[PDB]
């Protein structure tokens, strides 16, 4: 975050752990709100030849 180092030390002593390692707030490690397009594969029964429906 942006907390003062003395406040950071106070938080670490009060909680007993190192809060700077794991923060509940998300800052920049999340995925981008815009993503490249996908391709989404088809499936097993998209064959043209050995795909008579009465066998599946």
């Amino acid at each position: 975050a942006s907390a003062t180092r003395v406040i950071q030390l106070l938080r670490n002593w009060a909680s007993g752990r190192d809060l700077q390692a794991k923060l509940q707030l998300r800052y920049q490690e999340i995925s981008k709100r815009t993503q490249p397009p996908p391709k989404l594969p088809v499936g097993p029964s998209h064959k043209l030849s050995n795909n008579y429906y009465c066998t599946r």
Partner: protein, 216 residues
């Protein structure tokens, strides 16, 4: 009855059935009229015994294949409705019903279309399928739709504008026409496609590869 069947009848009655049965193999008796056309030196209509070998007939009456017997690529022995056979089969095949049925073709009407190695075999079979497309009466669904479907697929195959998987699908399409129609025009349209797929699949696959690499 066919004109030949009725025409040979008075001679059969006069000379007897035994004389007619003297010629040809068993259950394939008598003489037959052969129309040899295509890539032969002397295309012609001739009369010959039933079980004459194909090679002997071609070299004797038709003058041989254009460019020698080693130039032969394929033969359609019974008109457009019979599947083609490659050179390795036209070496020791007899021109009767049973011998040609054994080679998976059938004698049909004894019309020998000869093609040498200077031909685009896929184009010839596509032209035959287009003929069957233009001569469909359009009554029953299998012929009416599937023959046009096969014509489109073959026309696209000539350019190599498909993928190898389609080959198998085309085969199955033929199986959905043959045996499901009113008359035998559906069977006669499905059979040449099956013969081509059976005997010249590497040619189709190579053409598709060439088109794929040329067009990226």
């Amino acid at each position: 009855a066919n004109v030949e069947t009725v025409a040979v009848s008075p001679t059969i009655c006069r000379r007897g059935g035994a004389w007619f049965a003297s010629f040809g193999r068993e259950r394939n008796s008598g003489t037959k009229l052969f129309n040899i056309s295509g890539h032969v030196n002397h295309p012609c209509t001739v009369e010959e015994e039933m079980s004459v070998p194909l090679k002997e007939l071609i070299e004797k009456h038709a003058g041989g294949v254009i460019g020698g017997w080693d130039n032969l690529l394929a033969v359609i022995p019974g008109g457009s409705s019979t599947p083609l056979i490659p050179k390795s089969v036209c070496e020791t095949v007899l021109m009767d019903f049973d011998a040609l049925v054994q080679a998976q073709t059938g004698l049909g009407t004894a019309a020998v279309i000869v093609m040498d190695r200077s031909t685009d075999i896929v184009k010839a079979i596509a032209r035959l399928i287009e003929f069957y497309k233009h001569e469909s009466c359009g009554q029953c669904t299998p012929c009416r739709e599937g023959v046009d479907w096969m014509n489109k697929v073959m026309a696209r195959f000539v350019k190599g504008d498909a993928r190898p998987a389609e080959i198998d699908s085309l085969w199955e399409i033929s199986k959905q026409i043959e045996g499901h129609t009113i008359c035998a025009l559906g069977d006669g349209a499905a059979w040449p496609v099956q013969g081509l797929i059976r005997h010249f699949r590497p040619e189709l696959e190579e053409r598709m590869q060439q088109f794929a690499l040329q067009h990226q």
